[PDB]
């Protein structure tokens, strides 16, 4: 069944949960654009972040696990043949989001997979190195001008390499949903006070 593999596997949020997350992400993009902490550092980044990221996910929001490219991607077949992948296909999950983030290229949500969910994370250089398994897991909320969504995962890894050693620094804002951190280079992270739960289905997208 190699030739019948999807473009990618992942957790695809339901219609209702995709909308709840989309709205939460839009609220963040507008809160952030109007924080003077953010305004100060536009040299490093009025800018309306909602329009800036007006390359929309042409579909439901999702957390990709394995890019397969219909079986041409490296490791596509070994991922998809796993028993846990077959048995999880079509099943319902409630995933945890711990933070929202923005860079000059992407806007996203950080997904904190549990040990059990990591079984669906696929089995590196020096951007995922030293970080826990599955740290790349994210939901893209928007991309800038010419950016493709694969970039969102690389941007989150870069941010998390900072958080690793407390380079996150002191908070520069205390929003009702969490504290706001300026990581420099136009990088921003809202650490949510309480995790967001999103309902999703593990499945595959064929383009």
């Amino acid at each position, epitope marked *: 069944e190699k030739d019948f593999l999807p473009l990618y596997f992942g957790w695809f949020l339901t*219609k209702k949960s995709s909308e709840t997350l989309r709205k939460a992400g839009q609220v963040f993009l507008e809160e952030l654009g109007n924080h003077k902490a953010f305004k100060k550092e536009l040299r490093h980044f009025k800018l309306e972040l909602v329009s800036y990221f007006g390359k929309r996910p042409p579909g439901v929001l999702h957390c990709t696990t394995k890019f397969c490219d219909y079986g041409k991607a490296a490791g596509a077949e070994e991922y998809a043949q796993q028993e846990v992948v077959k048995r999880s296909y079509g099943k*319902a999950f409630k995933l945890s989001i711990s933070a929202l983030f923005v860079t000059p290229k992407t806007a996203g949500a950080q997904v904190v997979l549990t040990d059990q969910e990591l079984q669906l994370w696929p089995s590196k250089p020096s951007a995922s190195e030293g970080l826990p398994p599955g740290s790349r897991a994210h939901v893209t909320l928007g991309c800038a001008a010419d950016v493709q969504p694969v970039q969102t995962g690389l941007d989150l890894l870069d941010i998390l390499q900072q958080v690793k050693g407390g380079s996150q620094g002191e908070a520069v804002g205390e929003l009702p949903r969490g504290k706001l951190y300026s990581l420099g280079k136009g990088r921003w992270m809202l650490s949510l006070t309480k995790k967001m739960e999103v309902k*999703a*289905i593990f499945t595959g997208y064929y383009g």
Partner: nanobody, 127 residues
Framework: EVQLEESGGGLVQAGGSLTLSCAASGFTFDDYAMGWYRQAPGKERVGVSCISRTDGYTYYLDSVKGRFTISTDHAKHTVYLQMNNLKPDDTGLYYC?????????????????????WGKGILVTVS
């Protein structure tokens, strides 16, 4: 504020049939999911059957497939579980469940993940 009211359980001889019913009060919209979970002696609660009111899509635990049928009455906001050819292994506390997300709840998610709303449970004893 949603409330789930269960009925239809009790004692039945092996090979018999029961129909469980659960009425949901307090939902403000039609597009939600309802289903049934069972706790057998010594075991954790497990999804038995779930349904999406609008789509009608159904999930069945493999051990009940063919024997149990789930259905809804739209106007009455009630779900029904028709249990035929009952076996002693079907004994347990049966719990109605509902969830506001019809796509999530209609898949009978594991209780690890959960459902938004739960009934109190009704006993089915198959002798």
């Amino acid at each position: 504020e949603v409330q789930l009211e269960e009925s239809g359980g009790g004692l039945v001889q092996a090979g018999g049939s029961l129909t469980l019913s659960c009425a949901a009060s307090g939902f403000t919209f039609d597009d939600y999911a309802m289903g049934w979970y069972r706790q057998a002696p010594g075991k954790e609660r497990v999804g038995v059957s779930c349904i999406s009111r609008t789509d009608g899509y159904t999930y069945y635990l493999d051990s009940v497939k063919g024997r149990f049928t789930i259905s809804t009455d739209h106007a009455k906001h009630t779900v029904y579980l028709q249990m035929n050819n009952l076996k002693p292994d079907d004994t347990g506390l049966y719990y109605c469940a509902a969830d506001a997300d019809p796509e999530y709840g209609s898949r009978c998610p594991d209780p690890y993940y959960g459902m938004d709303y739960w009934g109190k449970g009704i006993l089915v004893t198959v002798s």
